[PDB]
């Protein structure tokens, strides 16, 4: 895990640095959900243009893990599934963590019956 | 006679729920709801067992399959002696063996799957027409099939026919139970569907991926939890809402439920209808309204056509033009 | 032959869970667990369906009842044609009809109930002995009976024989699934049992309360949820724990689970063994160890005797002596 | 409901009053759980000797609602089931509400199968 890498006081700083060194950018940590069947993604940190929608960010993730088109995922932010049309800025405002980063997980969608 | 006594005994069990516990409970609405079950696998079987206990009288199974040797332990209307036989009609017969007054029917019908070549345009035209008619005939549609692409056409047709869809889907140790949104002519509010949560058109996920049996490789508990929640969602949904809330005499009516066995949890969630959704986007609805089967046949063979129509291609191109900085 | 294929197909389905998903999963431990089901009603039936799908080979039903006309819609091993017949042996036969390799047995045995007069000391002495032997013979005991008092004697005997008990119980729209604590010779830690949460000895709740049928007047969904969770709790519990946690390859092993349908929720809870508990108090254990059936027969006919032995009478007298100020 | 009777600022006061006007006393609100099948209890407020155990308080409730001996209940404090041997003082310390009162609900125990 990332949040389990010991650096809380450092995180708030890394989050502040980003807030200044970059504009129109959302600091995001994106990781695979535990127990979910879906390819891993080692690169977990992202500076995301604030005007991108959730769906555009999902597209970025899909490409990063090289997921094939026939398989779908969904994302959780604070155990909620955000609207696909929402701006990452609005999501960041609502769900940003104490440490300044927005935490997201992704999981394979269920299909069996 | 024994059958009359069965009828009166089940009836009394239900009446007592209203008389003694929840006087405002509407039992009749539940009894008279015509239910279409798309899928007669582990979900379809357990969902039907929960429905008959609630007093539902008409259940119609749609499944093109046969009973496999691994099925009976997980698919709770079939026995060892049934293996090799057509599932849907057996499931109907099994319900009547439990409670002979059931108006239970089975239909061996293939649902045309998006992303797959049309093998026989005419025969599948008929499958499409038959599916639309069954959907139109019934009141509540449970979507209990076994792939991503099998959920597309029924979701569209149910939206077109303005029917309530309850969609349930399983993974190894998790599950999803949700009600799809419907179109409101006056209200600009609409709830999401199964396809609103990602950004790819459904396509062929099957011709490629080996290990057929993995679609039933799940902790046995997940099918039972999902099935029971799907039915209780239906019974609550059928009740009238209290004035100032999203609740009924049976309690909540969540849009979407996701459960996980590893930590024994359940989340209640809600999402709005997504403008670029390849199933429920107004542009997709409009395309169907214009050309019907002539549009559907195009989308079936060309999933990318849906991404063009619904606008998914546009939002993705926009990410392509960003340049080398959503990375390091 | 067909039976060999059934055997190999179910076996493969299970193997794939380990090979492809959870390499550390112990399937053999689950297959070889001898399960005693006390109760063959809505819980006993659904619990047994979840067990066979997990590969469990030996299941023994204990139930003194017959199939009623209202039962088949809710009790998922029985059909309309079965009504009037003895439940336990029918349930066993029904499991074999699903999967013929099952070592499934049924026993029409009455469990002596605390608070009720002994009608025939000798015959019930034999019931007691038979119950203790079945408990001793099996590995995991599911307590799936239909009253408070029916849970007492099996809880005590299982603690005495050091067996794992999974206790499940239903209400109209809620349920409880818990594992009872066991005695550890060295550790002073022990988890609670069903009787640890209140302060009255179990007694006759039945001779008085009218409306027999209310014990099956429940939303159909609750039995399916409780049954599925009880079995998944068992499968996780049977796995080895990771070094620094209360988790296994299958995830959590909660002491106690309480779920509610009205708001689609599930709580994970934990309580310690209560010193004055009328089932698991060390004084009650000591009394059994000394006199066996000669103690039990006394407690059966005199529930208040348990309150004396366990110290419940003491703590209640203390409240009596408070004086008129825990009120207005 | 009680907490829905509008008086937050008043509650903290009523809780302070009790803290002074009375010693060795725990201010408690005890109500029937929603949807639970169990007799109502109109008297919901209690000043409970801090040295009483949870089980002794359960006994008090049982008598108040005139529950027969053959029927059991369980109590929730903040969606937890407290140990029957615990002192009400320790429970109060752990679970006391912002407004100074300890909130408890009681429900009929499940028995069906
Ligand atoms: Zn949609
Ligand atoms: Zn106990």
| DSSP states of B47-107 | HHHHHHHTT--EEEEE---B--TTSTTTSTT--GGGTTSBHHHHHHHHHHHH-TT-EEEEE
Q: Is D106 on the interface with C (CB under 8 A)?
A: no
**Using CA of residue B160, residue B161, residue B162, residue B167, what is the dihedral sign?**
negative
Rounded CA gap, B181 and B201, in Å? 19
Dist. CA A57–CA B250, nearest whole Å:
38
Tokens read off for B87: 């599932």
Minimum-distance ligand to the CA of C283? 2
Q: Are B170 and B74 in contact (CB under 8 A)?
A: no
Phi, psi of D20 (to 5 degrees): -110, -50
Nearest CA among C55, C39, C122 for reference residue C88: C39
Q: Find the helix or strand (DSSP H, E) in which C106 lies.
A: strand C103-107
Structure tokens at B14: 């239900």
Query: What is the crossing angle of helices B42-53 and B87-98, to 10°?
Result: 30
Q: Which ligand is nearest to the CA of A55?
A: 1
Residues C270, C313: Cα–Cα separation, whole Å: 25
Token code pair at residue B168: 């349930």
Specify the length of chain A in residues: 113
How much distance in Å is there from the Cα of C192 to the middle of ligand 2?
A: 5
Alpha-carbon gap, residue B259 to B228, rounded angstroms: 12
Chains adjacent to C (≥3 CB pairs closer than 8 angstroms): B, D
Closest ligand (CA of B156)? 1
Q: Is C215 on the interface with B (CB under 8 A)?
A: no
Helix, strand or coil for residue C258? strand
CB contact under 8 A, B216 and A112: yes
Contact call for residues A62 and A41 (beta carbons, < 8 A): no
Strand partners, C141: C36, C165
Helices B220-237 and B42-53, interaxial angle, to 10°? Answer: 40
Structural domain boundaries in chain A: 1-113
The two structure tokens encoding residue D18: 């009790």
Resolution of the entry in angstroms:
1.9
C53 CA to middle of ligand 1, Å? 34
Enumerate the H helices of chain C as residue ranges: 2-16, 27-31, 42-53, 87-98, 121-137, 152-160, 220-237, 282-291, 293-301, 303-310, 312-320
Using alpha carbons, select from B130, B188, B190 the residue that is nearest to residue B157: B130
Q: Return the SS3 of A6.
A: coil
Nearest-angstrom CA–CA distance, B66 and B69: 10
Q: In angstroms, how far is the first alpha carbon of chain D from the final one?
A: 32
Tokens, residue A68: 């094939």
Distances (CA, A) of B239 to B18, B56, B232, B327, C219: 13, 15, 11, 50, 14
Alpha carbon of A27: minimum distance to chain B alpha carbons (Å): 11
Residue B245 C-beta-side C-alpha neighbours within 13 Å: 10
User: What CATH code would you report for A1-113?
Assistant: 3.10.20.90
Q: Are B25 and C172 in contact (CB under 8 A)?
A: no
Smallest CA–CA distance from B37 into chain A, residue: A113
3-state secondary structure B107-172: ECCCCCCCCCCCCCHHHHHHHHHHHHHHHHHCCEEEECCCCCHHHHHHHHHHHHCCCEEEEEEECC
**D25-32/D45-49 β-pairing:** antiparallel
Residue C134 has which token pair?
């079945």
Distance CA B56, CA B30 (A): 6
Is the separation of the CB atoms in C74 and C220 below 8 Å?
yes
H helical segments located in C17-161: 27-31, 42-53, 87-98, 121-137, 152-160
Domain count, chain C: 1
Cβ atoms of B35 and B139 closer than 8 Å: yes
Query: For helices C293-301 and C121-137, what crossing angle results, to 10°?
Result: 120
Give the nearest partner residue to C70 out of B9, B69, B224, using CB atoms. Answer: B9
Cα(B312)–Cα(B290) distance, rounded to whole angstroms? 21
B171 to A37: CB separation less than 8 angstroms, yes or no? yes
Place of tokens 């939206």: B159
Phi, psi (5° rounding) for residue C102?
A: -55, 130
Question: What residue numbers bound the domain in which C64 lies?
Answer: 1-328
- Nearest 5 degrees, angle CA C223-CA C227-CA C229? 120
Q: Please give the Cα distance from C8 to C16 (Å, whole number).
A: 12
Helices (H), chain D: 8-21, 54-64, 88-95
C-alpha separations of B56 from B63, B248, C223 in Å:
20, 19, 18
C74 and B CB contact within 8 Å: yes
What's the Cα-to-Cα distance from B98 to each of B71, B271, B276, rounded to whole Å?
Answer: 19, 38, 45
Q: How far are the Cα atoms of B9, B91, C64, C137 from residue C90, in angstroms, in the given order?
A: 21, 21, 12, 21
Q: What is the dihedral of CA D88, D93, D96, D99, to 10 degrees?
A: 120
| Residues whose CB falls within 8 Å of the CB of residue B317, separated by 6 or more in sequence, listed in order | none
C97 touches chain B (CB under 8 A): yes
DSSP 8-class letter at B21: I
Distance B275 CA to ligand 1 centre (A): 8
Phi, psi of C280 (to 5 degrees): -110, 0
Q: What is the CATH number of the domain that holds C235?
A: 3.40.50.720
* Residue A51 touches partner B, C-beta closer than 8 Å: no
Distance in Å from the first CA to the final CA of chain C: 78
Question: B288 C-alpha to center of ligand 1: Å?
Answer: 15
Instruction: Give the whole-angstrom CA distance, residue C169 versus residue C146.
Output: 8
- The shortest C-alpha distance from D29 to chain C (Å) reads 13
Cβ pair C271, C297 in contact under 8 A: no
C-beta of residue C301 within 8 angstroms of C-beta of residue C117: yes
Query: Cβ separation of C98 and B79 shorter than 8 Å?
Result: yes
Helix (H, G, I), strand (E, B) or coil at C269: strand
Locate all alpha helices (DSSP H) within chain A, ordered by sequence.
8-21, 54-64, 88-95
The residue count of chain C comes to: 328
Helix (H) or strand (E) holding A22: none
The tokens describing C72, both together, are: 């088949």
CB B146 within 8 A of CB B213: no
Measured between alpha carbons, how far is B124 from B112 in angstroms, rounded to an integer?
7
Instruction: Please report how many Cα atoms fall inside a 13 Å half-sphere around the Cα of residue C153, on the Cβ side.
Output: 32
Q: Please choose, from the candidates D91, D66, D64, the residue with its C-alpha nearest in 3D space to the C-alpha of residue D76.
A: D91
* Inter-chain CB proximity B260 and A35 less than 8 Å: yes
Strands C256-260 and C265-269, by their bridges, are antiparallel
How far is the first Cα of chain A from the last one, in angstroms, to the nearest whole number?
32
Q: What is the rounded CA–CA span in Å between residue D84 and residue C192? A: 10
What is the torsional sign of CA D71, D76, D77, D83? Answer: positive
- DSSP assignment string, C48-77: HHHHHHTT--EEEEE---B--TTSTTTSTT
Query: Long-range contacts for D80-84 (Cβ within 8 Å, ≥24 apart)?
Result: D80/C269, D81/C197, D81/C256, D81/C269, D81/C271, D82/C271, D82/D54, D83/C271, D83/C272, D83/C274, D83/D54, D84/C196, D84/C197, D84/C198, D84/C199, D84/C271, D84/C274, D84/C276, D84/C277, D84/D53, D84/D54, D84/D55, D84/D58
Output the six-digit token pair for A105.
Answer: 């997980």
Residues B253 and B233 sit within 8 Å (Cβ to Cβ) = yes
Report the DSSP beta bridge partners of residue B191.
B272
| Run of H or E residues at A103 | strand A102-108
- CA B43/CA A99 separation, integer angstroms: 42
Pick C266's closest partner by Cβ from B6, B211, B264: B264
| Dihedral (Cα; D9, D12, D15, D17), 10-degree rounding | -70
Give B224's contacts (C-beta < 8 A, 6+ positions apart).
B46, C46, C49, C50, C224, C225, C227, C228
Inspect the interface and report whether the beta carbons of C221 and B228 lie closer than 8 Å: yes
Method: X-ray
Residue the block writes with tokens 């002979």: B100
CB contact under 8 A, C172 and B263: no
Coil, helix or strand at residue D24 = coil
Q: What angle do CA A28, A30, A34 make, to 5 degrees?
A: 150
Q: Which ligand is nearest to the CA of C156?
A: 2
Give the other-Cβ count within 10 Å of D26's Cβ: 24
Q: How far apart are CA A13 and CA A24, in angstroms?
A: 18
Nearest CA in chain C to D71: C205
D69 neighbourhood in chain C, CB within 8 Å: 200-201, 203
């Amino acid at each position: 895990t990332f949040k389990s890498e010991y650096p809380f006081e450092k995180r708030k700083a890394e989050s502040e640095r980003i807030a200044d060194r970059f504009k129109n950018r959302i600091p995001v940590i994106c990781e695979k959900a535990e127990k979910s069947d879906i390819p891993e993604i080692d690169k977990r940190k992202y500076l995301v243009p604030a005007d991108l929608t959730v769906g555009q960010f999902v597209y970025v993730i899909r490409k990063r893990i090289m997921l094939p088109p026939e398989k779908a995922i969904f994302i959780f932010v604070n155990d909620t599934l955000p609207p696909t049309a929402a701006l990452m800025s609005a999501i960041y405002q609502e769900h940003k963590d104490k440490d300044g980063f927005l935490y997201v997980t992704y999981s394979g969608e269920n299909t069996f019956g | 006679d024994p059958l009359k006594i069965a009828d009166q005994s089940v009836d009394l069990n239900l009446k007592l729920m209203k008389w003694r516990i929840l006087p405002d409970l509407n039992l009749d609405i539940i009894k008279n709801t015509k239910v279409l079950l798309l899928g007669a696998g582990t979900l379809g079987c357990y969902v039907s067992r929960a429905l008959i206990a609630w007093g539902v009288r008409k259940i119609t199974f749609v499944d093109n399959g046969t009973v496999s040797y691994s099925n009976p332990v997980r698919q709770a209307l079939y026995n060892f002696e049934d293996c090799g036989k057509p599932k849907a009609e057996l499931a109907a017969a099994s319900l009547k063996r439990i409670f002979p007054l059931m108006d239970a029917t089975g239909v061996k019908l293939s649902i045309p799957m998006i992303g797959h070549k049309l093998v026989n345009e005419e025969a599948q035209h008929k499958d499409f027409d038959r599916l639309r008619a069954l959907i139109k005939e019934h009141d509540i549609i449970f979507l209990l099939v076994d792939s991503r692409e099998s959920r597309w056409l029924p979701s569209l047709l149910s939206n077109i026919e303005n029917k309530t869809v309850i969609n349930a889907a399983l993974g190894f140790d998790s599950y999803l139970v949700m009600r799809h949104g419907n179109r409101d002519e006056q209200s600009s509010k609409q709830l999401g569907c199964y396809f609103c949560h990602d950004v790819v058109a459904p396509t062929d996920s099957l011709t490629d991926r080996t290990l057929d049996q993995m679609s039933t490789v799940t902790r046995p508990g997940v099918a039972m939890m999902a099935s029971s929640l799907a039915v209780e969602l239906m019974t609550s949904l059928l009740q009238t809402k209290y004035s100032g809330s999203e609740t009924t005499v049976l309690g909540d009516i969540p849009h979407q439920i996701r459960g996980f066995l590893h930590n024994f949890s359940i989340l209640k969630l809600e999402t709005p209808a997504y403008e670029h959704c390849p199933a429920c986007s107004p542009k997709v609805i409009e395309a169907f309204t214009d050309l019907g089967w002539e549009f559907v046949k195009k989308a079936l063979e060309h999933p990318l056509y849906l991404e063009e129509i619904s606008g998914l291609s546009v939002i993705k191109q926009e990410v392509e033009r960003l340049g080398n900085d959503v990375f390091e």
